[PDB]
Design a protein around this ligand. Structure first.
Ligand code: BER
Lengths: 186, 186
């Protein structure tokens, strides 16, 4: 394939090197491609990037649904989502690339034109869990949305700013977190 | 001084042009030093930069020392340090230089050495708030080292991954975190 072969090197580039660190030239070089390929469906570089997030985000979002069955009550759905995100190979490994891209593009409002659409799948997992949890009376959350975002980010914090130490110690901290969090919701 | 003079100018460059773009050649000339003197003092740009960060960390620690005097209880110091971490980084000139350096030298397990000591100094702040919380019974924690790593990285997450909402909602979200988190300790 051509496109699915570009996104295959581009993603690997954004992960290994930063966002800025990987150049369109590089992608085209280890893909035997040209400049044209990037025009009709692959416009700007930020387009290629925002696209890889979308894919990744979904591969993750999907692995979560084929793996959340192992969780009975939402309280378990909370711990488990926060645990899996630490071991996934999807999206979360690009967080660094994202940090850059989210600062190298603040003046250009053409970003949030589809950026926040991604931010939604980001807090959706937490939005369902916190809500369906009210139903199951597992807790009483009145501001589900704030909490949804607070959780997603806090979690992304622990996954991202601890990507160097013993993976097992990580699963430990993240767990004490979920625990301390949910417990603070009642 | 010629050492501080290198640091002064170096920090200004990094702020103006970033980490990658600043050459040690600029630093050397603009600071009126020599390649020899710059090498003898820092060896590399990586260390020089790591050296500024150390100094910034220290300015942060003093600022925090003079600021926390607005928080009587460690319960308020917690809210305050968190908010402080959000507001101040918002207009931090180096932010961008750090992001480059960080997401460009975290691949080298070498630089991760001094890099860990640093972050830890930023986490001690919490360790301290929690230990003094215990000794004052605002809460009970036996794993102060853990929660501190948690809080610090959850806060950090909430700061970094939400560089989009309006500064006013962000603080609400952070004070909402501070609240929940702190409540999950009793
Ligand atoms: C010279 O001024 C400085 C210098 C250095 C600063 C460093 C940090 N902050 C302000 C600073 C500042 O504010 C004025 C905000 C809180 C914070 C949390 C962190 C972190 C670094 C910092 O890494 C881990 O989590």
């Amino acid at each position: 394939n051509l496109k699915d072969k570009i996104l295959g090197v581009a993603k690997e580039l954004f992960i290994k090197n930063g966002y800025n660190a990987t150049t369109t030239g590089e992608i085209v070089k280890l893909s035997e491609s040209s400049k044209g390929n990037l025009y009709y469906h692959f416009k700007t570089k930020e387009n290629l990037f925002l696209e890889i997030l979308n894919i990744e985000q979904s591969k993750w979002q999907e692995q979560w649904k084929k793996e959340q069955i192992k969780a009975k009550t939402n309280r378990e759905k909370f711990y488990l989502y926060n645990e899996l995100s630490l071991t996934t190979e999807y999206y979360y490994p690009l967080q660094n690339a994202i940090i850059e891209f989210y600062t190298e593009y603040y003046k250009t409002n053409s970003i949030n034109e589809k950026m926040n659409k991604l931010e939604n799948k980001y807090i959706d997992a937490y939005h369902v869990i916190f809500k369906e949890g009210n139903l199951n009376g597992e807790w009483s959350i009145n501001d589900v949305n704030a909490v949804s975002k607070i959780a997603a980010n806090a979690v992304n914090g622990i996954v991202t700013f601890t990507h160097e130490q013993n993976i097992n110690e990580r699963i430990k901290l993240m767990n004490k977190f979920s625990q301390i969090f949910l417990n603070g919701l009642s």
